[PDB]
Write a protein that binds this ligand. Sequence first.
Ligand SMILES: Nc1ncnc2c1ncn2[C@@H]1O[C@H](C[C@@H](N)CC[C@H](N)C(=O)O)[C@@H](O)[C@H]1O
Ligand SMILES: Nc1ncnc2c1ncn2[C@@H]1O[C@H](C[C@@H](N)CC[C@H](N)C(=O)O)[C@@H](O)[C@H]1O
Lengths: 389, 389
Amino acid sequence: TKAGSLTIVGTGIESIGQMTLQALSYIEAAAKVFYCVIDPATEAFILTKNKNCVDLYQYYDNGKSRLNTYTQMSELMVREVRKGLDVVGVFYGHPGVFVNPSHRALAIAKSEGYRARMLPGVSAEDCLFADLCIDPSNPGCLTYEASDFLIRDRPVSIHSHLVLFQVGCVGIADFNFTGFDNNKFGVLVDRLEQEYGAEHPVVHYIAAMMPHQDPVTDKYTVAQLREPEIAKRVGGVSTFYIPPKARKASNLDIIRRLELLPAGQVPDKKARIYPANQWEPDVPEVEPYRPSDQAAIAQLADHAPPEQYQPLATSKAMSDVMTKLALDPKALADYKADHRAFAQSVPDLTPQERAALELGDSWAIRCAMKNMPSSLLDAAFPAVIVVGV
Amino acid sequence: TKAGSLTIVGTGIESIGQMTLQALSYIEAAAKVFYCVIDPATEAFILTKNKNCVDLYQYYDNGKSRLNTYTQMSELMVREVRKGLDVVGVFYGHPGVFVNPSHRALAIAKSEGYRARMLPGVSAEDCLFADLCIDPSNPGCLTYEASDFLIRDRPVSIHSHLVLFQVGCVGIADFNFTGFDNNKFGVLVDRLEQEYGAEHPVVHYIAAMMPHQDPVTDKYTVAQLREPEIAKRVGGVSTFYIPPKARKASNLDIIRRLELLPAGQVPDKKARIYPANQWEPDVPEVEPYRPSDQAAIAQLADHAPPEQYQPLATSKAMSDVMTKLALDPKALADYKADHRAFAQSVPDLTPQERAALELGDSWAIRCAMKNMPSSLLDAAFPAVIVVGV
Ligand SMILES: Nc1ncnc2c1ncn2[C@@H]1O[C@H](C[C@@H](N)CC[C@H](N)C(=O)O)[C@@H](O)[C@H]1O
Ligand SMILES: Nc1ncnc2c1ncn2[C@@H]1O[C@H](C[C@@H](N)CC[C@H](N)C(=O)O)[C@@H](O)[C@H]1O
């Protein structure tokens, strides 16, 4: 193992709070931190967590190709990796979602034989789902960069969600500190009119970046985007959400092959699961408390945990060590280097807990931390599926 | 304002570390916590952070419609909201990504006039981007639930990413504690063959759930998914990634309208930005250090921060309060109720810092925390765009 590693992490969108615990722990552990964030409170927070930080944002410039900036950003990180340092790169949101220099730097580090990993973060699209109250599952999600969407004539589905990033810099490859002169925005609007019609809704979405702010969730018709007062509101942190125009019908062959038949009464294409998408035009009211819902709720009074449910049955020592492995990158490295030596050094573990850590197998650890009922193991593996469409 | 609120949060995918700081803070602040997580270390962690937790997973049962479970899960949360409690629901990953009961509970709470919010988290798709080293931007991303994909004949694009969730329970609406008998998996494979061909790659993806694990990133051909030994590896935490088959050409009309013309030499449709997608079949090697890259790197020696770059210039007191607003939900509520009273109570703030908090405007706060150069304001607003495709 060569000295030197690159770990790229995110900060999420909303200041500080949307950073993951592991992003924070790696920032603290790093020999050197390179960051590219928008809000100053997140920047200030990062600087309190590591004494050796460099702002990558200073490598942008007016009329300077963003591609040249990205090469430089990547090279600054990889240079420090080559010197043998544990380097952390920090990008706002998810660091691999609409981000060039992270993928570049990691690929170079990997190709030169250094440890390289991206830790996922909360993207603007994650925020969009939360704030617009939609689920990519229902009814599928198409996500594009706005210029790419136009230039390569990327397909839309009128029956699925559409999310467009970078709608504030349509056709612009460079940078200006005072913002983009988004003069080709009308080209995007023409495409949206062709695909959806002039009266179809488009949600202008800006996630709150500070904890006390509300998101921008402004619905406009496609036609309204041509109004100069509306178009000028679209900036560098603007994303568009375009809801579906209609519900798609079910395929009879698939209904048959999946054996969803009974008497033929699969629900209608508009027989929606509550709640309906509130952005979709002319969506009918969906009843939250149907007779089936009421009957399910009536069963709560007599509910008991099923015999195959596996209650948590762990110990402070085991919870402590699993927490430490998640929150202390140095402890994790030590454990990964020698499971046995690490496991045997952890105080207060039971024999089963020690053995499970010695092995490292997910099953053994799960087994040490949950009571597995005899009924369960006699029948016949994580299984947590929380969507039913 | 009625007593009672519902805040739904995520834990991310990988045990503990992928929880956001705000998810943790809301879990700690809650009067009651309802959770649905897969790994026991995350469960144990949650139980150390709040004394009043209920496992929602006990409302699944063998042969019990998942829809009935979801109604019950939602109702357990909303009942406590109605009693006037600050309730936190916790779902693994992102709590609104392929999750029924979160959206249900929030919509009901909102309709009855209670405070209701979803906080985004790290989804399995976020993990997929990080672990497979792909960017949804390049070349667009289509995301579907696997049964829905089939039943409603959702379109694929051979030129964009395809991500399929719930590939381990194709056509299954119920639950079994011992896992799904995924007997209709072959129907998914037939669809993938029709769309992509028998020799096209499909990546079986399982993100590591424990900090020491590696992800499953196993490439198979579509044809190989028919092998029983391979099909049985696909379970409840399996996601498929299907890379593009080809590069899409540019639209000449759009090239003209966006004025990307010069002598006509837009890059070829295969003239890729490094790095190439390593999963895509027959991708050529892309040079990381082209002459343009080398020239950009040569400019680093003489680099100075641009005159319009805005250096951080804050104080401990201001950083402390912005951190507190992000990490202390009670402090945030107090600040939101009365900006002036809150701002005037914060020790050690400068006059400008106090005034900025009194107003709450993003501009004023940004202004108090960053030195804005005279050159910047004379020219003519966040602007952090890190992808150039
Ligand atoms: N606060 C925000 N609200 C909505 N969309 C945003 C926000 N910030 C960034 N974006 C979107 O992300 C684009 C910038 C991207 N290069 C970076 C995205 C970032 N890596 C993420 O994870 O979301 C913007 O042009 C917007 O489309
Ligand atoms: N560890 C994992 N690796 C890859 N995919 C996963 C993992 N865990 C869950 N999934 C995907 O998510 C599905 C379950 C969903 N109902 C819940 C997803 C969860 N809310 C998320 O944010 O990803 C599974 O069937 C998989 O498709």
